[PDB]
Amino acid sequence: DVGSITLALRTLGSFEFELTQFVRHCADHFLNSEHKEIRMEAARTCSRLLTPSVSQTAVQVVADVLSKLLVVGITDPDPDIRYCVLASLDERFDAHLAQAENLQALFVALNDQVFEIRELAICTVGRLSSMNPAFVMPFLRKMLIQILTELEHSGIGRIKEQSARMLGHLVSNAPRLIRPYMEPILKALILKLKDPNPGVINNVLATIGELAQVSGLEMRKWVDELFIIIMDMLQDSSLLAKRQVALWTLGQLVASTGYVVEPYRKYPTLLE
Amino acid sequence: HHHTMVVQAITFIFKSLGLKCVQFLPQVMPTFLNVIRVCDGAIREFLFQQLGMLVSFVKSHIRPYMDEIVTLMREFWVMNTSIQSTIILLIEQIVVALGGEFKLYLPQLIPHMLRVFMHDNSPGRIVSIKLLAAIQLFGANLDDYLHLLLPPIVKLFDAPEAPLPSRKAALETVDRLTESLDFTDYASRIIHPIVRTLDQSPELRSTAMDTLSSLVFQLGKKYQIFIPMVNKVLVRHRINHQRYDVLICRIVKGYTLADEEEDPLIYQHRMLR
Amino acid sequence: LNHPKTRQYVRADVELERILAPYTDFHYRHSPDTAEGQLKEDREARFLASKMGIIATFRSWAGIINLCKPGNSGIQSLIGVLCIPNMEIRRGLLEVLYDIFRLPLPVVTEEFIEALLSVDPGRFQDSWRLSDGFVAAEAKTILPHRARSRPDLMDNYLALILSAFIRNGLLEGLVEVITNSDDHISVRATILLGELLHMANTILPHSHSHHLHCLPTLMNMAASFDIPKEKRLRASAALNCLKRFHEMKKRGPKPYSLHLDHIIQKAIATHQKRDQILKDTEEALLINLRDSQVLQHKENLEWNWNLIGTILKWPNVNLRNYKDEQLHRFVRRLLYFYKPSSKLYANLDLDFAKAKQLTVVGCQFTEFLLESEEDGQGYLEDLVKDIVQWLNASSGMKPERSLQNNGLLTTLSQHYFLFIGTLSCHPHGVKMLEKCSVFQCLLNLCSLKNQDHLLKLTVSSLDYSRDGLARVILSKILTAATD
Amino acid sequence: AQQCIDKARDLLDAELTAMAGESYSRAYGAMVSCHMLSELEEVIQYKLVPERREIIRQIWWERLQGCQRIVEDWQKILMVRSLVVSPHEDMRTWLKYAS
Amino acid sequence: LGLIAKTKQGCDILKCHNWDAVRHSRKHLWPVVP
């Protein structure tokens, strides 16, 4: 039976057809299933199959199944199902996740111990931000404060890098919300780069490039130190570290700042 | 040479005068800290203890001088030395004295504390237990830092290798301080570790179960969905417990509608008056 | 200030904005020749008069338009004053702000969470007692209005005024006061800010409400690492308070009286039933009932009532498969204690420390009996006819005194009705109710014209979900009764 | 378009490396085409979000003020830049071209 | 003018003349704009 159910669910999620009762029947399996793989694949097929969400009869079944897989992805013990269902919660249902209960379940999920879920959930909520501030914004502000606090008082590199990746996915997922808080972000990060595992440097560079992306002409008063530190990293590069991302950042700023021709003379060694 | 007797005479003076010794701080403390910076030898260990007595006396008017204190507590804090037992007592007396404005100076002592949870060689890790008992007393001081200071604490009882009394202390400390803090959205980070560690020590069944039961008081009905996941583990040793049973009883089965999910702080307030 | 002819008669910027003098001035001297013996009381009188005048002028259109001209109108001056550290002026303006927006004032206090509860909309009201407004008035406040599309101009006016204040940078001064001031005033300003924000996303159009809630200035100061730390930490705490405030807003008002809570409970139950778990046989049963401390002695006030409720509501204990002698003694002890003839249950007075718990436990016990029918017939019968006996005795079924008005108004025997309430719900319950002289006894009660509050309590306990003998009773009540 | 430009990048890279080993002026003839190629991303941005329009319009002028003053290359650089701007929108560049 | 803003078509009319309005009903006090 174990191979039969897994194969049948995988095939159902696999091939195309033109079904509506099978997912309503699917509530029997994972609510009581103790076999991990069948629950996981049932979650996959149920998340996948109901994308066309328009007629005024079938909202009931999609709402119920949303409740079911949201709570299952909240609750079940092994983190693999957590991550795998959270991956399925992409924008494909963005305009319908805006129910209050979904948001409160998401806030509950927002803080756990394992970090892949950190990144995925924070991306999801950041995408979710701009269409309904009323719920998310306060919790978002507390978060942002909290991440700043780790980034600066954490005497552990792991937490610092983790907060940096938090910041990166924040800036990616929230286009307009992050704009007013640019000044403390950039100043903290640049003071971090001139600090007296280098992956922290990699992630801070990726994030600072993204901050350049979101912000046009508002980094005018910080371009100089950025240039000097970046070319110091490049010129006489002590380690053949992740250069391609470093070059991508260095290129990113000028195309946004509109800083065009001065560096070739004020940094004469640049072109060679 | 003769500094021990003069300093003990000083603290005798300060206990003798009582409240009215306050005007004498400005011309005594700066020299005291300058000496501490320049002082040397194991006598320094004595000195700090005496300084603790000083801070015990004038509750609030130590404030302008205390900032420098912090960076000296930073400087002479060796990672693994017997000096830590006394520095813990220093911190305890600080907490008892300030009590409410303490959060102002909380950050600067955080990082070292963190590494103590890891880079420690105490037999049975008694220093971790001591500092943990000290952390119990912060109360409304750590309102904004829980997110960083909890993950260590949960981590210490995530290791099966730790001495069992240390795990008991960790569970106790997490269990009790909830009577002063807000612990609602921080559910997932605790529920799963408890069900992980539930069956890995047959003695730690009771302490852990009552810690969980105490925690679920703060969370109102929103616990309702978690019940079957713990349920299977609950009877898998045929272990039953009273208060948790009471709590699940009046959540699953209707008690009232206005007694659901109030902030823990307002209930602490109402029991205070 | 309306008619052009009238407008020609009055000067530009000396007449109307005069009334806000005693706030814009630090030392206002209204009269030349005053008695020295009293000075400050002059200031309180002046402040009261000016405050009432101010809240008067912001009602009329002429005041609003005139007081917010694009020039350096006085309303800008008021807000500009707000950011000067003068200890009483900043506690003069906040009152004006509250009763402009018709908000409930908080009690002055140095601690936030108490002030929070002090202005909860679900706060008890004196008129909600039995004698005054027993249910209808309270039900007016707690449950929401039924209109879905009616305009409610009042919110329109408030939106206009709110936008008017938003234009002139009111939030900046609010944040300034929250940061740099005393605590007695910080709590007041924080509460005002939270309430205004909650009004924002409720009555304000999106474009004017999509950027306010970002809170730029406060948040910016919150993360500056060069400013003195006091501002930083107090701003952090302010944000925490704001979040908890909003969460309490989403909590929603909840009933304090038992009747409304029970009514909404039945309503949600039947509407849920419209649209579509531990066994515990014997072992833990014995454990708890042994631990229940009840079998040791019949003296009240020494029992673990919470554990009692746990036993009473546990799912699979139903006395139908389970005939236990200790259970029989337990249920007999409860049956006796709850009896009006026991003169213990009815002789604990109101305002007891642990009373509402006792009442819900009693309704619990009655529901338990309703669950265990085919062998527990008698247990309810004697108790219910004892209740009706006490009922007739208090109503005047005897010619001795016929006046026991000090019996129910101060004792929980009034709450006996709730049991009939939970008896009047289930279909087996109504056949039980008609088994004894209840419906007819109630119809005999309604013929009385001297005791009134009996009608008050009884009318609020009956079920009306199903057609039956209860409905004709209420029909007679609304047709045959006192004014 | 982005994949097209990505292929164009290395198909210029080949001859750019083959041409760079000798001297800078020799690589100028390929560098003009490279700066040709990478400007198209700015055309995409101009067509997509109408808020950056003035800034990119200004920086086009400043970037172009520094190249070698020979009519032939100004021809094509302005002609590709003209893809999204009418001549009557930017009078200043065309006057200098005419001069 | 707030009155004539009760319907979607009227709101479309008004938005042409730089006047904002609320686009949700009172049924749920936390409305998401699509």
JSON list of N, CA, C and O in Angstrom, two decimals, chain C residues 459-476:
[
{"chain": "C", "resi": 459, "resn": "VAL", "atom": "N", "xyz": [-36.95, 36.88, 32.18]},
{"chain": "C", "resi": 459, "resn": "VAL", "atom": "CA", "xyz": [-37.08, 37.11, 30.74]},
{"chain": "C", "resi": 459, "resn": "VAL", "atom": "C", "xyz": [-35.76, 36.92, 30.00]},
{"chain": "C", "resi": 459, "resn": "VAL", "atom": "O", "xyz": [-35.77, 36.67, 28.79]},
{"chain": "C", "resi": 460, "resn": "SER", "atom": "N", "xyz": [-34.63, 37.01, 30.70]},
{"chain": "C", "resi": 460, "resn": "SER", "atom": "CA", "xyz": [-33.32, 36.96, 30.07]},
{"chain": "C", "resi": 460, "resn": "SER", "atom": "C", "xyz": [-32.71, 35.57, 30.08]},
{"chain": "C", "resi": 460, "resn": "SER", "atom": "O", "xyz": [-31.57, 35.40, 29.65]},
{"chain": "C", "resi": 461, "resn": "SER", "atom": "N", "xyz": [-33.44, 34.57, 30.56]},
{"chain": "C", "resi": 461, "resn": "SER", "atom": "CA", "xyz": [-32.87, 33.24, 30.72]},
{"chain": "C", "resi": 461, "resn": "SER", "atom": "C", "xyz": [-33.49, 32.20, 29.80]},
{"chain": "C", "resi": 461, "resn": "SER", "atom": "O", "xyz": [-32.87, 31.16, 29.55]},
{"chain": "C", "resi": 462, "resn": "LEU", "atom": "N", "xyz": [-34.69, 32.44, 29.29]},
{"chain": "C", "resi": 462, "resn": "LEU", "atom": "CA", "xyz": [-35.37, 31.44, 28.50]},
{"chain": "C", "resi": 462, "resn": "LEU", "atom": "C", "xyz": [-34.77, 31.35, 27.11]},
{"chain": "C", "resi": 462, "resn": "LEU", "atom": "O", "xyz": [-34.25, 32.33, 26.56]},
{"chain": "C", "resi": 463, "resn": "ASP", "atom": "N", "xyz": [-34.84, 30.16, 26.53]},
{"chain": "C", "resi": 463, "resn": "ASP", "atom": "CA", "xyz": [-34.44, 29.94, 25.15]},
{"chain": "C", "resi": 463, "resn": "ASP", "atom": "C", "xyz": [-35.63, 30.23, 24.25]},
{"chain": "C", "resi": 463, "resn": "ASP", "atom": "O", "xyz": [-36.78, 30.12, 24.68]},
{"chain": "C", "resi": 464, "resn": "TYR", "atom": "N", "xyz": [-35.35, 30.62, 23.01]},
{"chain": "C", "resi": 464, "resn": "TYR", "atom": "CA", "xyz": [-36.40, 30.91, 22.04]},
{"chain": "C", "resi": 464, "resn": "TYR", "atom": "C", "xyz": [-36.03, 30.36, 20.67]},
{"chain": "C", "resi": 464, "resn": "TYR", "atom": "O", "xyz": [-36.63, 30.73, 19.66]},
{"chain": "C", "resi": 465, "resn": "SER", "atom": "N", "xyz": [-35.04, 29.47, 20.64]},
{"chain": "C", "resi": 465, "resn": "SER", "atom": "CA", "xyz": [-34.60, 28.87, 19.39]},
{"chain": "C", "resi": 465, "resn": "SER", "atom": "C", "xyz": [-35.70, 28.04, 18.75]},
{"chain": "C", "resi": 465, "resn": "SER", "atom": "O", "xyz": [-35.88, 28.08, 17.53]},
{"chain": "C", "resi": 466, "resn": "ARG", "atom": "N", "xyz": [-36.42, 27.26, 19.54]},
{"chain": "C", "resi": 466, "resn": "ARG", "atom": "CA", "xyz": [-37.46, 26.38, 19.05]},
{"chain": "C", "resi": 466, "resn": "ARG", "atom": "C", "xyz": [-38.83, 26.89, 19.47]},
{"chain": "C", "resi": 466, "resn": "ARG", "atom": "O", "xyz": [-38.96, 27.60, 20.47]},
{"chain": "C", "resi": 467, "resn": "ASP", "atom": "N", "xyz": [-39.85, 26.54, 18.69]},
{"chain": "C", "resi": 467, "resn": "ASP", "atom": "CA", "xyz": [-41.21, 26.92, 19.08]},
{"chain": "C", "resi": 467, "resn": "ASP", "atom": "C", "xyz": [-41.59, 26.09, 20.30]},
{"chain": "C", "resi": 467, "resn": "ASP", "atom": "O", "xyz": [-41.18, 24.94, 20.43]},
{"chain": "C", "resi": 468, "resn": "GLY", "atom": "N", "xyz": [-42.38, 26.69, 21.18]},
{"chain": "C", "resi": 468, "resn": "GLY", "atom": "CA", "xyz": [-42.81, 25.95, 22.35]},
{"chain": "C", "resi": 468, "resn": "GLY", "atom": "C", "xyz": [-43.57, 26.84, 23.31]},
{"chain": "C", "resi": 468, "resn": "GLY", "atom": "O", "xyz": [-43.99, 27.95, 22.96]},
{"chain": "C", "resi": 469, "resn": "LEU", "atom": "N", "xyz": [-43.74, 26.33, 24.53]},
{"chain": "C", "resi": 469, "resn": "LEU", "atom": "CA", "xyz": [-44.50, 27.01, 25.56]},
{"chain": "C", "resi": 469, "resn": "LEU", "atom": "C", "xyz": [-43.81, 28.25, 26.07]},
{"chain": "C", "resi": 469, "resn": "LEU", "atom": "O", "xyz": [-44.48, 29.12, 26.65]},
{"chain": "C", "resi": 470, "resn": "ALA", "atom": "N", "xyz": [-42.50, 28.37, 25.89]},
{"chain": "C", "resi": 470, "resn": "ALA", "atom": "CA", "xyz": [-41.79, 29.57, 26.31]},
{"chain": "C", "resi": 470, "resn": "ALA", "atom": "C", "xyz": [-42.23, 30.80, 25.54]},
{"chain": "C", "resi": 470, "resn": "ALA", "atom": "O", "xyz": [-42.36, 31.88, 26.12]},
{"chain": "C", "resi": 471, "resn": "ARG", "atom": "N", "xyz": [-42.48, 30.66, 24.24]},
{"chain": "C", "resi": 471, "resn": "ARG", "atom": "CA", "xyz": [-42.80, 31.80, 23.39]},
{"chain": "C", "resi": 471, "resn": "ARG", "atom": "C", "xyz": [-44.10, 32.47, 23.78]},
{"chain": "C", "resi": 471, "resn": "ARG", "atom": "O", "xyz": [-44.17, 33.71, 23.81]},
{"chain": "C", "resi": 472, "resn": "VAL", "atom": "N", "xyz": [-45.14, 31.69, 24.10]},
{"chain": "C", "resi": 472, "resn": "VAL", "atom": "CA", "xyz": [-46.40, 32.30, 24.51]},
{"chain": "C", "resi": 472, "resn": "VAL", "atom": "C", "xyz": [-46.22, 33.05, 25.82]},
{"chain": "C", "resi": 472, "resn": "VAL", "atom": "O", "xyz": [-46.88, 34.07, 26.06]},
{"chain": "C", "resi": 473, "resn": "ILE", "atom": "N", "xyz": [-45.31, 32.58, 26.67]},
{"chain": "C", "resi": 473, "resn": "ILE", "atom": "CA", "xyz": [-45.03, 33.28, 27.92]},
{"chain": "C", "resi": 473, "resn": "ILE", "atom": "C", "xyz": [-44.51, 34.68, 27.62]},
{"chain": "C", "resi": 473, "resn": "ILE", "atom": "O", "xyz": [-45.02, 35.67, 28.16]},
{"chain": "C", "resi": 474, "resn": "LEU", "atom": "N", "xyz": [-43.51, 34.78, 26.76]},
{"chain": "C", "resi": 474, "resn": "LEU", "atom": "CA", "xyz": [-42.96, 36.09, 26.43]},
{"chain": "C", "resi": 474, "resn": "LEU", "atom": "C", "xyz": [-43.99, 36.95, 25.73]},
{"chain": "C", "resi": 474, "resn": "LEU", "atom": "O", "xyz": [-44.03, 38.18, 25.92]},
{"chain": "C", "resi": 475, "resn": "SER", "atom": "N", "xyz": [-44.85, 36.34, 24.91]},
{"chain": "C", "resi": 475, "resn": "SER", "atom": "CA", "xyz": [-45.92, 37.09, 24.29]},
{"chain": "C", "resi": 475, "resn": "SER", "atom": "C", "xyz": [-46.84, 37.71, 25.33]},
{"chain": "C", "resi": 475, "resn": "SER", "atom": "O", "xyz": [-47.19, 38.89, 25.24]},
{"chain": "C", "resi": 476, "resn": "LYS", "atom": "N", "xyz": [-47.23, 36.93, 26.34]},
{"chain": "C", "resi": 476, "resn": "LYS", "atom": "CA", "xyz": [-48.04, 37.50, 27.41]},
{"chain": "C", "resi": 476, "resn": "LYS", "atom": "C", "xyz": [-47.28, 38.59, 28.15]},
{"chain": "C", "resi": 476, "resn": "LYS", "atom": "O", "xyz": [-47.85, 39.62, 28.52]}
]
